[PDB]
A paper describes a structure:
Phytochromes are biliproteins of plants, bacteria and fungi that use red light as a source of information to regulate fundamental physiological processes, such as photosynthesis, seed germination, flowering and shade avoidance. The molecular architecture of phytochromes shares a common photosensory core module (PCM), which is composed of PAS (Per/Arnt/Sim), GAF (cGMP phosphodiesterase/adenyl cyclase/FhlA) and PHY (phytochrome-specific) domain4–6. Bacterial phytochromes can be grouped into prototypical and bathy phytochromes, in which the red-absorbing Pr and far-red-absorbing Pfr are the thermodynamically stable states, respectively. The conjugate Meta-F and Pfr crystal structures has been obtained from the engineered photoactivatable near-IR fluorescent protein (Agp2-PAiRFP2), derived from the bathy phytochrome Agp2 from Agrobacterium fabrum.
Starting point of the present studies was the crystal structure of the PCM fragment of wild-type Agp2 (Agp2-PCM) in the dark adapted Pfr state, which crystallized in the orthorhombic space group P212121. The parent Pfr state of Agp2-PAiRFP2 (2.03 Å resolution) displays the same structure as the wild-type protein determined here as well (2.50 Å resolution). The BV chromophore, β-facially attached to Cys13 via ring A, adopts a ZZEssa stereochemistry. The N-H groups of the rings A, B and C interact with the backbone oxygen of Asp196 and a conserved water molecule (Wat722), whereas the N-H group of ring D forms a salt bridge with the carboxylate group of Asp196. A hydrogen-bonding network around the propionate side chains of rings B and C involves the side chains of Tyr165, Arg211 and His278 and is extended via several ordered water molecules to include also Tyr205, Arg242, Ser245, His248, Ser260 and Ser262. In contrast to PaBphP-PCM, the tongue region of Agp2-PCM is not directly stabilized by crystallographic contacts to symmetry-related molecules within the crystal. While Agp2-PCM shows a parallel orientation of the two crystallographic monomers, Agp2-PAiRFP2 monomers crystallize in a near anti-parallel arrangement. However, the overall topologies of the monomers in both structures agree very well, as demonstrated also by superposition of the equivalent Cα atoms of both constructs yielding a root-mean-square deviation of only 0.6 Å. The chromophore interaction interface to the surrounding amino acids, especially potential hydrogen bonds, hydrophobic interactions and water molecules, are almost identical for the Pfr states of both Agp2-PCM variants. The Pfr Agp2-PCM crystals lose their diffraction capability immediately after irradiation with far-red light at ambient temperatures indicating major protein conformational changes in the crystal.
Numbering used by the authors:
A (entry chain B): 6 to 80, 86 to 503
B (entry chain A): 6 to 80, 85 to 120, 123 to 503
Amino acid sequence: YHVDLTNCDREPIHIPGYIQPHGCLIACDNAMRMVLRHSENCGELLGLEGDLNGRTAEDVLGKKLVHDLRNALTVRPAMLPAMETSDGRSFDISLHRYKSTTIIEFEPSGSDAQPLGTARKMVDRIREADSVESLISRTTRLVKATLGYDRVMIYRFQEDGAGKVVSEAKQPELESFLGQYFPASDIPQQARALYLKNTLRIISDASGTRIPVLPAVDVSGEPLDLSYAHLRSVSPIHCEYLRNMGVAASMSISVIVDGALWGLIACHHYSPRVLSMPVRIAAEMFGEFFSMHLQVLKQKRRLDTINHAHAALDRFLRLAAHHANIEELLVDSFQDFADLMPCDGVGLWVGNNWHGHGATPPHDAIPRLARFVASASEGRVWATHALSQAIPEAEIYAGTAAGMLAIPLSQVKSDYLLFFRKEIVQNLNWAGNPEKSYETGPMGDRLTPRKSFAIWKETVRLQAQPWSEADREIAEAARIALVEVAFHHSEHH
Amino acid sequence: YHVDLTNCDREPIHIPGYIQPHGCLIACDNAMRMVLRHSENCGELLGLEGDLNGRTAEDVLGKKLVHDLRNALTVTRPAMLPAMETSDGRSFDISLHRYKSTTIIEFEPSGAQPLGTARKMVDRIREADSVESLISRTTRLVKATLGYDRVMIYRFQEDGAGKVVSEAKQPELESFLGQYFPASDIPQQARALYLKNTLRIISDASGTRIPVLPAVDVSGEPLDLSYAHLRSVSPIHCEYLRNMGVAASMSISVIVDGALWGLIACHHYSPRVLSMPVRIAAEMFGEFFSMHLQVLKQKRRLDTINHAHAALDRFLRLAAHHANIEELLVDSFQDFADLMPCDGVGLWVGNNWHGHGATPPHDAIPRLARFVASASEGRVWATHALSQAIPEAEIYAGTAAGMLAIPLSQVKSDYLLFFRKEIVQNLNWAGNPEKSYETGPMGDRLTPRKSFAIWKETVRLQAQPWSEADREIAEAARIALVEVAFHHSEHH
Ligand SMILES: *C/C=C1/C(=C/C2=NC(=C\c3[nH]c(/C=C4/NC(=O)C(C=C)=C4C)c(C)c3CCC(=O)O)/C(CCC(=O)O)=C2C)NC(=O)[C@H]1C
Ligand SMILES: *C/C=C1/C(=C/C2=NC(=C\c3[nH]c(/C=C4/NC(=O)C(C=C)=C4C)c(C)c3CCC(=O)O)/C(CCC(=O)O)=C2C)NC(=O)[C@H]1C
């Protein structure tokens, strides 16, 4: 098997048959009696002799260590820093069970503070963040300062799966990717699945030598599943991508919001680098708190936007009761509805007359739009972020208005309060350098940030920022309020 | 102050001037240089001699201990320090805080780790996927783990009264499950302290109170013991516990929206106090309980609101195919009882009554409708005390004590009405009415029997209050019905 751009979307990266050289790996049977597999560098690091497969775990590791590892197993992978081996030495061991196999991963110990102490220091620096913007800004600076990586970013996954760089702390000499996007294909489903499963993903050396697991394919033809093994080797594609950037190493912290991958906190370094296990425990704890605090802020934000909308629509209902002419009130008031949700324009289409405000289509194109919604909707809110896919003629004005949300004012007449958004590329706040070129490998320019961003621009060409579930809930509240205004008007007139 | 039944609602329980005998207390100045106050038992427990006041902290505690405590004081809640050294080779569990201008140090003799015990308890409640399940697990779990004779959970009602919503007890004890106590049984100052402190400890309800020397200092100021866990108990509550047979207790406060949702109350029928490490764990457990309770409450609310929308959305689609909207409502009104908790429901349209479940008789509906027309401003009107608004409603208060009214029109006085029974009719009380209690000098007021009777009087002729969630559902329904009438006007 030879990974390339044709088949890399289905690469079995969970069973590479190699590990990274910053530790060694031993795979035992389910009960941890027999050594079934081992990495080739086990002899170097653990100071072991000849061939490990066939020997008992007690023989290889000692009675005392096996006893202790069986205890941690009984009580995600179990993280055991500063374990004492048979010789006069200390090792950071991680331990888990998946499929039938028990995988044991080893790292030379160092001198580290307690994980809980380090995590607690970090968490205390983001508790007082009272908005999502504040939290997202703090975290990249704080993580860079605590972990000591050259760049730290936060990606937020969009509705189509693309990633958006929403925060960045970098070395001053590096180029920026803040406000940049990458398309969904840059992270394949299998990689996303492992980001969802594992909190941390470590890469020590993008140009490092892959240490083989022996055997790669066992007596029965089965490969070793390394899904939860933190020493699992990296795809040649992503390694080439990192090399083209000049990145030698990385660590990701996954952000889990609704049991789903909201994004990543991505730490990159421009020379080989790995954190010790105790600092990785703390990073995992910090990631957990970051995700919870983000979720609280995100709800508070949502609740405040919905309540704002209700308060505005409530005020509008009371004003409207004192008006004999409802069409006139809307002609004067419609632009105030733009305040209810993010939009670049709003307009009123009543009795074949157009009144616009902000970035809208020209008045010639509105009849076509209103006619489409009349056929497409069943008398409730219709919305899209890709007008050209629905109405080919809309491509002409896509720069000014690529998306549309229509609120019906009547089930009899073809009247609408319309909301609009610009082409998403028009609202780019990219802080990067367009003259930054990139080195390439055998795969070519595909594996560079320049070409990734350009591919993303193509994926969203003639499209706007999608209408969120929150926006649609506000739209429904607005429709409902206007039905109420019309009915109370009918009652008294 | 000599507290009694006349004035116990305003008792300054934050400044009793005494502590409980299971530890000793030392009060220092703001910078922890000088000893200003000390409890009378400090000599016994700490092995010190003479009047401790006027001596330096360095003198009384030694140079090392003072240095270590000053470091802890830099680390907003009492610092808990288990297994601390005094240089006799004596271990003490020390709690430490600053409040007002006073540093308070509290000592207990020492005797597993907190994170391990809390961890085991939390794992036993993580998988609860309903408020009912969490509440039921927790009393059994806490009882088994902390070894108390009874564990209860109270949920505070909107009027301040507490309801016993869960219970784990010794089999020979009486049950208080499904019982209520009135707001007056926990005064505002006690509530404020329950909100401020996660744990409240009572080692001995018949134990002798150790005075704090001095109770009133040269300046005339008392010692504020609001965050001191050794703070002594009111004589009123001690008498209350003695009447029950309870000798000791530990409360864990449940905080939901920065507000006292309830307590996890542990009672014991002989003296009892948990060591500091176990109390740390209980505090950690209480924190998780509160968070997990909050997550389940939101899920429960979200599901009820979405259910209501799905029903109302279905009703809108069906109504589009009906030429007669009055007829549709006459056939469908009883289905609206599924939207929110209620004991009855009825339609009042064109001076015609159609009822279902526990409602007032048709005779009384004109009076009720007329009152809502005058009281409301065209939106949802609701009460849980009909007698207070309409005296004549006392006649049918047994059947219908609370009402929620949804206006169907601003021209006509038409309504969809929702009813609830007298709250005493829906009691599910598992206790024994034949269980009597002994009394002290204050009398039978300080007994569970009289408390429950007092609560019954406070809610007489009233129903379960209409919650903010019930009101949101009502507003969704009103709005839905307006849209039905409007779309009906459009095509007819
Ligand atoms: C056909 C397969 C491709 C592919 C596979 C993998 N990508 C993995 C990681 C990865 N890739 C990116 C993409 C980026 N796009 C950018 O524009 C950009 C910077 C400007 C980056 C860094 C990201 C963000 C990630 C993960 C997060 C991170 O490290 O920052 C990956 C997993 C690697 C692993 O095993 O750890 C695989 C496999 N990437 C492709 O582009 C295509 C062709
Ligand atoms: C005029 C003042 C009164 C008063 C004061 C205090 N009550 C405190 C605690 C307390 N009291 C109760 C009431 C109960 N009513 C019951 O029916 C009942 C059993 C079925 C009980 C236990 C409760 C629930 C509590 C909470 C503590 C616990 O559950 O153990 C209190 C604070 C004591 C302290 O310092 O810790 C004060 C002060 N209680 C009265 O009844 C009146 C008259």
